[model samples]
Target chain A: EVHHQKLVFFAEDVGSNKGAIIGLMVGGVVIA
Target chain B: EVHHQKLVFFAEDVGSNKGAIIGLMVGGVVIA
Candidate 1:
């Protein structure tokens, strides 16, 4: 779903709290 | 709204999701 409706999910962290990540950490898994 | 009711909000992606993130780059603002 490339819709903004779902984009609001990120905002939840912004609205509800904080957001984003880096350098490979947290909750497991990897990005490369 | 640290409530899990919103946690399920993230799951909207997990249920409907791809999931997670991390890096030395991408997006904006700044974290430190």
Candidate 2:
């Protein structure tokens, strides 16, 4: 058995608007 | 029998600064 991989991304708006956005991505293997 | 092929992601900023970010992830099956 294997575990799935996951990723996370974080960024902040440093121009005009003072805010941030957090993004994530989860992936797994699909057997066929 | 499986195939952990590949993945792709693309994002573009549609605000003051026009910029883009592209990323890719590739993995394979690990029998344990």
Candidate 3:
């Protein structure tokens, strides 16, 4: 009954915004 | 006093959360 799943971000061009891939879960199925 | 950033995950080889990524941030930067 909860959904907001989708995560795909990565930064490494000197890492200004830092690195990212920020969320993933399953058991309740949540990925962010 | 904050330095820990790296992320890379992609799942679709049946999407069973075998791949994993759980949190990331920048700007006051927090990673967990």
Candidate 4:
């Protein structure tokens, strides 16, 4: 079995709070 | 100016825990 890691995100502000680039080509074909 | 988004991560025990990936290539080169 493959184990997957979980991802989380958040935002914060002072006294309160808040808060890539990519290109792909495959086999002479652009798959972005 | 370009604003960059921040990233954070954490793990907890007895209650919680956590954490993608890909391959790349360049001119006749396989970059991983």
Clashing pairs in 4: A6-B19, A12-A17, A12-A18, A13-A17, A13-A18
Candidate 1 chain B: worst 10 consecutive residues by lDDT?
B6-15
Tens digit per residue, CA lDDT, model 1, B1-32: 33222222332222222334444344433332
What is the clash count for each candidate, in the order shown? 4, 0, 0, 5
Listed in order, the DockQ scores are: 0.10, 0.05, 0.08, 0.03
A1-32 per-residue lDDT for model 3 (tens digits)? 33343333432222123223344332233323
All candidates: TM-score: 0.17, 0.20, 0.18, 0.19
Query: Predictions ranked by DockQ, top down?
Result: 1, 3, 2, 4
Of 3 and 4, the candidate ahead on lDDT is: 4
TM-score of 2: 0.20
The lDDT per prediction is: 0.32, 0.30, 0.32, 0.35
Instruction: Name the Cα RMSD for model 1.
Output: 13.1
Name the docking class for model 2: incorrect
Evaluated on the second chain alone, the candidates' TM-scores are 0.20, 0.18, 0.17, 0.20
Winning model by DockQ: 1
